[PDB]
Amino acid sequence: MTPLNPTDQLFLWLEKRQQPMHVGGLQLFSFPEGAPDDYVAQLADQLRQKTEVTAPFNQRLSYRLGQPVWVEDEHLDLEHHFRFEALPTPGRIRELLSFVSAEHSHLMDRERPMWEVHLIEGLKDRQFALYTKVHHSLVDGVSAMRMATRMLSENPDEHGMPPIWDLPGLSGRQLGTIPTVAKELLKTINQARKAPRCMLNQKITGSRRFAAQSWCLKRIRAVCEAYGTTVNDVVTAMCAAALRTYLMNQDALPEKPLVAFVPVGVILASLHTDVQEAGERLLKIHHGMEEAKQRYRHMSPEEIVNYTALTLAPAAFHLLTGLAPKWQTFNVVISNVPGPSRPLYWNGAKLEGMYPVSIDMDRLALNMTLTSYNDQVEFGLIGCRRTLPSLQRMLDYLEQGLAELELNAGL
Amino acid sequence: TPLNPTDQLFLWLEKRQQPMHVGGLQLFSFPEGAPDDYVAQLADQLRQKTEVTAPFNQRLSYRLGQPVWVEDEHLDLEHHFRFEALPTPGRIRELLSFVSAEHSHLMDRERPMWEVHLIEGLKDRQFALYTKVHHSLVDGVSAMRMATRMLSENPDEHGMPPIWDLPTIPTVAKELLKTINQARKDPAPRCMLNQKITGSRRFAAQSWCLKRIRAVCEAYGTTVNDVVTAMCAAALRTYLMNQDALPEKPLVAFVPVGVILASLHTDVQEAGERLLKIHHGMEEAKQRYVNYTALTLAPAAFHLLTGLAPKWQTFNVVISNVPGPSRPLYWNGAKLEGMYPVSIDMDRLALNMTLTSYNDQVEFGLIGCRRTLPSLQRMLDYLEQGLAELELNAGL
Numbered sequence: 001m002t003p004l005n006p007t008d009q010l011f012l013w014l015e016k017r018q019q020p021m022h023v024g025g026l027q028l029f030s031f032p033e034g035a036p037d038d039y040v041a042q043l044a045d046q047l048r049q050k051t052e053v054t055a056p057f058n059q060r061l062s063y064r065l066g067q068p069v070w071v072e073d074e075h076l077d078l079e080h081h082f083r084f085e086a087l088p089t090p091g092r093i094r095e096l097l098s099f100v101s102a103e104h105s106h107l108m109d110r111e112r113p114m115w116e117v118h119l120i121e122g123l124k125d126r127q128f129a130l131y132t133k134v135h136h137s138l139v140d141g142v143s144a145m146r147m148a149t150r151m152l153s154e155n156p157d158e159h160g161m162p163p164i165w166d167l168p169g170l171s172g173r174q175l176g177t178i179p180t181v182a183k184e185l186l187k188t189i190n191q192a193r194k195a196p197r198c199m200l201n202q203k204i205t206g207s208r209r210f211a212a213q214s215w216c217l218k219r220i221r222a223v224c225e226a227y228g229t230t231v232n233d234v235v236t237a238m239c240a241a242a243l244r245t246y247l248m249n250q251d252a253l254p255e256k257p258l259v260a261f262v263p264v265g266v267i268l269a270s271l272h273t274d275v276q277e278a279g280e281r282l283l284k285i286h287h288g289m290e291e292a293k294q295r296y297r298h299m300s301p302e303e304i305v306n307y308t309a310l311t312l313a314p315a316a317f318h319l320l321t322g323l324a325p326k327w328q329t330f331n332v333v334i335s336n337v338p339g340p341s342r343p344l345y346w347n348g349a350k351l352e353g354m355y356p357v358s359i360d361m362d363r364l365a366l367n368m369t370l371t372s373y374n375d376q377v378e379f380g381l382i383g384c385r386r387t388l389p390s391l392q393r394m395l396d397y398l399e400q401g402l403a404e405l406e407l408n409a410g411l
Numbered sequence: 412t413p414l415n416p417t418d419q420l421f422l423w424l425e426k427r428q429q430p431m432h433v434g435g436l437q438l439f440s441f442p443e444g445a446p447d448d449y450v451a452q453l454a455d456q457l458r459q460k461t462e463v464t465a466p467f468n469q470r471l472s473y474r475l476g477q478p479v480w481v482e483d484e485h486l487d488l489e490h491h492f493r494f495e496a497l498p499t500p501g502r503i504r505e506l507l508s509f510v511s512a513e514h515s516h517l518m519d520r521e522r523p524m525w526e527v528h529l530i531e532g533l534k535d536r537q538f539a540l541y542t543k544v545h546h547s548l549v550d551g552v553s554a555m556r557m558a559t560r561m562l563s564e565n566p567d568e569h570g571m572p573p574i575w576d577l578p579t580i581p582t583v584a585k586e587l588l589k590t591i592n593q594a595r596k597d598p599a600p601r602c603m604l605n606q607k608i609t610g611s612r613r614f615a616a617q618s619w620c621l622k623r624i625r626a627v628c629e630a631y632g633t634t635v636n637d638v639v640t641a642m643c644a645a646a647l648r649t650y651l652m653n654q655d656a657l658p659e660k661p662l663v664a665f666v667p668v669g670v671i672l673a674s675l676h677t678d679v680q681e682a683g684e685r686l687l688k689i690h691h692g693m694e695e696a697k698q699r700y701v702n703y704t705a706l707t708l709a710p711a712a713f714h715l716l717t718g719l720a721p722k723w724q725t726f727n728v729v730i731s732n733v734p735g736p737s738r739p740l741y742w743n744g745a746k747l748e749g750m751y752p753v754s755i756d757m758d759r760l761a762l763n764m765t766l767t768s769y770n771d772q773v774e775f776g777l778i779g780c781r782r783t784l785p786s787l788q789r790m791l792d793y794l795e796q797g798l799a800e801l802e803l804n805a806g807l
C-alpha cells in the first residue's frame with residue numbers, strides 16, 4: 001500500500017535503544033466544573049469503548065520484499081494503545097514528570113501502529129493528564145502537536161468530543177549500513193569543494209529525564225519592551241541563561257559559547273554562554289539572530305534547502321559516527337512551534353498546559369522544545385538521564401534567567 | 412569479569428520482539444497495624460538504602476570485543492528503584508496489566524540490568540513488588556531464589572534489606588546444522604503458539620490451593636505434578652478451541668526435570684482420560700532416562716532461531732516447574748501472599764508457562780505475546796476449569 005517517503009525511512013533507520021525516535025506530548029487538564037471525585041476513572045471507561053480508529057493511527061509498518069510500506073491494520077487492540085495509569089503518592093508535578101520520563105524512554109513496538117495515549121489519574125487538586133507518544137516515522141513533531149490541539153475545542157459547554165485516534169533530507173536515498181551512508185556523506189562533503197566540545201554532546205543512554213514548565217507571556221513581553229527585543233529573543237535568552245547556569249553548576253561550562261540549532265529556515269545562533277550579564281547576553285543573542293536570519297533575505301526556497309543541506313552535512317556525519325568532533329556545529333536544538341491563541345477544553349476539561357516531548361540522540365543529549373498556549377509559553381526539556389544529572393533544575397535556571405533580566409531593568 | 416558463554420547467548424538472542432529479561436511479581440500484605448501511608452513511607456525509606464551488592468552493581472562492558480561485567484561506579488538508584496501506583500479500582504486485573512506493560516520494555520544495557528517497582532494503590536491493604544532482571548545477569552532460578560532469600564519466616568524480623576543489597580545468525584544456524592548432521596547418526600504440531608511474535612506482552616497469574624490439588628491426586632492416583640500439568644493441558648485445549656485453532660495432533664510441552672517432551676493429550680476429550688494419559692506419558696518418558704538432551708534439542712534450536720524448519724518445532728510450549736518455600740514468609744513484617752514468575756517469550760514460543768509453589772499454594776505465571784495470544788487472561792479461568800472438571804468427574 002502507501003510507501004514510506006524517504007524522511008520517514010530515516011527515523012526508522014537511526015533508531016536504536018539509546019535514541020528512540022518517537023515524539024510525545026504532555027497535556028494537563030482540570031476536572032470539568034462539577035465533576036464527580038472519580039471523574040478520571042469514569043473517563044477511562046468510555047475511552048476504552050471508543051473503538052473506531054482513523055488514519056494515520058490505523059497504519060502499521062510492513063515490508064514489500066525489501067521496501068517499507070504502511071498498511072491498514074486489520075486487528076488493532078485498543079487496550080494496547082490506550083492506557084489508564086495513576087501517579088504514586090503524592091501525585092504532584094514532580095511525580096507527573098517522572099511518569100513521562102519513564103514512559104518516553106521506552107521503544108515502541110514496530111509491529112503495531114506506533115502510537116500510545118496514556119491517561120494519568122492520581123493528580124492532586126482535581127487535574128488529570130494525557131501523555132501521547134507517536135513515532136516520528138508515522139507523524140512528525142508539529143502535526144502531532146497540531147492534532148493534539150485540533151482534538152480540542154474553544155467551547156467549554158460542548159461535550160462528546162472524540163479522542164486523538166479518531167479525528168475528522170535532500171541528498172539521501174536508501175537503507176544502508178552506517179559506514180556506507182557515512183561515506184556518501186564524506187563524498188558529498190568533499191565535493192562541496194572540501195561549536196565547542198560540551199557535556200551535552202556525548203554518547204547517551206536510553207533513559208530520559210523530562211522537565212516542563214509554563215511562563216506567563218505578558219511577563220515576558222514586559223521584558224521585550226524594556227529591552228526593545230522580541231518574544232523569541234527573550235525565550236532564547238532564557239535557554240542561554242539556563243544552559244549557562246547548568247553547565248557552570250556542573251563545572252562543565254565551555255570557554256567558547258554554546259551554539260543552538262534554531263528553526264525559524266535554520267539558524268545556527270550563538271547562545272553566548274560566555275557572557276555574564278543578562279542584558280548583554282540577551283542583546284548579543286538578539287542581534288546575532290537578527291543578522292543570521294538576514295543571510296536568508298536574498299534566497300529562494302531552492303536556495304535555502306540547498307544551503308541548509310550543505311551546511312549541515314558535516315554535522316550529520318558527526319552525529320552518525322562520533323568521528324568528527326570539530327564538525328559538531330551545534331550543541332543543542334531549541335525548537336519553537338507556536339500554538340493556539342485562546343483557551344481550550346476537552347469535553348469541558350480545560351487544557352491548563354501543553355508541553356512537547358522531543359527526541360534526544362547520541363551527541364545531542366538535550367533537546368529543548370517550546371510552544372505557546374494562550375497566556376503562556378511552554379518549555380519542554382527532554383534529556384538523557386545519565387549524561388544530564390538533575391536536569392529538572394534547569395526549570396529554576398530558566399526562571400532565574402528571566403528574573404535576572406527583570407531585576408536589571410527594574411520591572 | 413567476562414560473561415560466561417550462556418550469559419552471552421541471552422544478549423545475542425535479544426531483539427525488540429523478544430527481550431531476554433525475567434521478572435517476579437511478589438504480592439505482600441501490610442504489616443500488622445501499619446498506617447495507610449505505609450507504602451509511600453516504605454517507598455521513601457527504600458530510596459535511602461543506597462548501597463548495592465553484586466550482581467546488582469555489575470554492568471556490561473566490552474574489552475576490545477568480548478563482553479565483560481564491571482562494577483558500576485555511579486549507580487542511579489532513582490533509575491533502578493521506582494515507586495508507582497495502580498489506577499482505579501486497584502484490582503489484581505490492574506496489577507496484571509501493569510506487569511504486562513513493564514515486562515514488554517527492553518532494559519538499558521548502559522546500566523545494571525535490574526529494576527524493582529514498588530506498587531501502591533492495591534485495593535485492600537496490600538502492596539506489590541515487580542522485579543525485573545536481565546537473564547544474562549541473573550537467571551530465572553537465581554532470581555526467584557534471591558527473591559525469597561530476601562524474606563524471612565520471622566514476622567518480627569525488621570531492618571531487612573531490599574533485593575539489591577544483601578550478602579551472526581546465518582553463521583550460528585549453519586553451525587547448528589553441522590552439529591545436527593554429525594549427531595543424527597543415532598542408532599509437535601503446527602500451532603498458533605508457534606509464530607513470530609511482537610514485543611508487547613500479556614501476563615496472567617493466579618494461585619490454587621495444594622489441598623484442592625492433593626484431593627484430586629488421591630482420587631486418580633496421580634502426582635501433584637501430573638495434575639498441575641493436566642490443568643495446563645486442559646487450559647491450552649480450551650483456549651485453542653475457543654480460537655478455533657486446536658490442531659489434530661496433541662500439543663507437546665517442553666518440561667524441565669534434564670528435559671522431557673511430554674504430550675499434553677489436547678486431542679483427548681475427557682478430563683480423567685487426559686489426566687491419566689499425561690501421567691503414564693511422563694512416567695514412561697522419564698523411565699527412559701547432558702549429551703542426549705543437548706543433542707536432541709539442536710533441531711528445535713534451529714527452527715526457533717531461523718523459522719526454516721517447522722517440522723523441527725519439537726515442542727509447542729514450555730512448562731517449567733521450580734519449587735519454592737514451604738512456610739509463610741515475611742518482609743519487615745509484610746506477609747508474602749504470593750510470588751509469580753514472569754518468564755520469556757520468543758519467536759515461535761509465544762507462550763511460556765512457569766510454575767512455582769509457596770506455602771500452601773501452587774503459583775501459575777503465564778507470559779505471552781499480546782497479539783498472538785488475544786485474551787490470554789482467559790487461561791486462568793480455563794486452568795481453574797481444568798481442575799473443576801477433574802473434581803466434578805470424581806464427585807468432590
Ligand SMILES: [Cl-]
Binds near residue numbers: 107516517518
Ligand atoms: Cl524500554
Ligand SMILES: [Cl-]
Binds near residue numbers: 020021
Ligand atoms: Cl520508539
Ligand SMILES: [Cl-]
Binds near residue numbers: 108110113114116
Ligand atoms: Cl506501540
Ligand SMILES: [Cl-]
Binds near residue numbers: 101105207208
Ligand atoms: Cl529513566
Ligand SMILES: [Cl-]
Binds near residue numbers: 518522523526
Ligand atoms: Cl533498566
Ligand SMILES: [Cl-]
Binds near residue numbers: 080512515611612613
Ligand atoms: Cl503491551
